[PDB]
Amino acid sequence: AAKDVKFGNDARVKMLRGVNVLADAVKVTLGPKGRNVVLDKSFGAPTITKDGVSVAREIELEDKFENMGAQMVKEVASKANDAAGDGTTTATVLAQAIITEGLKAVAAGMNPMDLKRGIDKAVTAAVEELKALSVPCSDSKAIAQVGTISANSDETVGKLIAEAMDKVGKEGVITVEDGTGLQDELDVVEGMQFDRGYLSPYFINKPETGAVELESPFILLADKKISNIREMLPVLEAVAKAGKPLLIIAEDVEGEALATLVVNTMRGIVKVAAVKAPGFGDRRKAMLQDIATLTGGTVISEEIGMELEKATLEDLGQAKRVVINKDTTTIIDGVGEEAAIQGRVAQIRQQIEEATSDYDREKLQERVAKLAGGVAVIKVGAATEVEMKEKKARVEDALHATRAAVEEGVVAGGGVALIRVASKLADLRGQNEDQNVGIKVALRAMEAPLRQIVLNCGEEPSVVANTVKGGDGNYGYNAATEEYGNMIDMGILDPTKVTRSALQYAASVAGLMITTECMVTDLP
Template identity: 70%
Template structure:
């Protein structure tokens, strides 16, 4: 029973479907295998025979596969996977059309009884504003920044003293500033909030997404998407030396309590394509299902 559970679980992780078929096949292989071994067959010869049979069957299945090309076919597959719920199948088809083959589709429990499809443009990560005082739209409780500079800082910001020259340059430019850092607290946060409330600085701050090495990689993704640099002492860049051209930019940034969305970053197309190619290579190489899922999410965001 434990082995059949593992078969079904692994099939679901790799293919996302087909658990019933995998369970039936596994049960048949075990039953017939036991018979063969009981009749005197060498188990290693049996294993080699199974491997050859698998290769032959897979090759034949590939010849008979039909590539899905229309929304109706996608809806049909989605309906079957949703246990016959045609409404869900249709919604899956619409989502696939809108985000493409490398987009990310997530399913979340609604706070009401309607099933909705929400398409998010740009790069979104699950970190909201550090303080509600950064909100610009009190009705929707969002911080909306038009054509902002984006400071991408790897460490925590507890004091603004090292970046005062940069803040002065941002104020003179008349453009908003988004700070993405490990955290912003203490004197730094208090000073930013006071300046925002006084109207001297259009600013918002969010915590960097992810943890550890994944955080570093995601900050680099954001930097490439927005045409900026990750400010990190490991790379020999100190906050005191940062100038406006080292900051990222985007057409728009929207921040709510839980998420930050960067729309139309100013990164170079070739740099973004190169980063995508690098992530695809990592997806091919990794043996961890969790790492593969996180890499695919990063790829979709880019």
């Protein structure tokens, strides 16, 4: 495939336009008072939306290059969200702010490498300032606080989160299920979650969450790399006539059997999904046996002689639910006997007596934790089905912000925190005069989100900006009600993680661009 190669300025100009289109489409939705974007849909009536994540998803341009620009900012802003729970749009909005101004600078004839240095410093500095502005969120009161705010003034959502964390810990695994009655429920149940994601996006059966939700499936606990689909035919035919889904946990699943299971589900007979086993090497042995115990399943080790062709349902584990996403698997309510699960705990607890390393002690402890520590489930109750799966959605939203608030605290939400940290470090210098421009570009970028919220509301940016700057701490403007005050008191907050992630991620991609000299892509 012959390529089209663009250099230095050309390359960058293309990139700039690319990112502007992304940002100009996505940014008009930022405030509590965003504007709508209309998103066409092949069949039927179009989609009107104020949701930046939705708009972004749709952005792809004809001019490759220009497209690359847009796609780059999209990638990184989505990672922000990935790591924090929000900021996708903010990250984009800031990404544009640096990219525009920095990229003008380079084109004016200033030094790219210095401009990046300056920005990177301004960010490093503001990140610190953010930690300072940050108000911790630690006690049950504070947990429920950010929960309720994040769930839109609903005090009962704040409660349920606070209660869950109060039961299984700030670390413990909390999931959300559909409610059976009008009543909310909180139950703790034998279960577990491990940092391993789906082997294929085509496993997703809930497109809106980018997640795999499987109803009381059997669980296959293999120990080899599943490459051939042949080993499957006995077990995949039993879990077919059992009319139930099937979760596979093994070393891996290679294309040969992966791509088959893929097309086998996406419009096909048995609907299933598979994920890699937790841990590597000597750890995975016992780490997999833990899940076995928890689900009352049998581990099919090759090192024992058993094959997958020599496996029936009686070998498969079982759990009342299981959700998989990009990079997490969590199984809910394992049928494994209490006498067994408590027995395994006693075995591992004893093994901690070894204490040959603070790595081995801490590693065996993480295993005790997952197993006997369990998974807390929230069932969201509501009156109507519409209300239900809507409330259920805000509960997941709040849980997200709360986990994040715990880790790094909360700050002024209106763009405010960024506007604040910026007016703090307004002396900042570098060595190059070029690095100064770098710091300033970055600093002035930090006003973008507030300025934009205000603008979307149809108020003057400069004027609200100026008066937010005129204050201190978390004093800001609440665009929804047009009153200045303490943003946190007024219930307009962002978890510290998210404001930071957003900024850092916007800064990364901007630096990357400011330092790009070549761009390679296919011919039109």
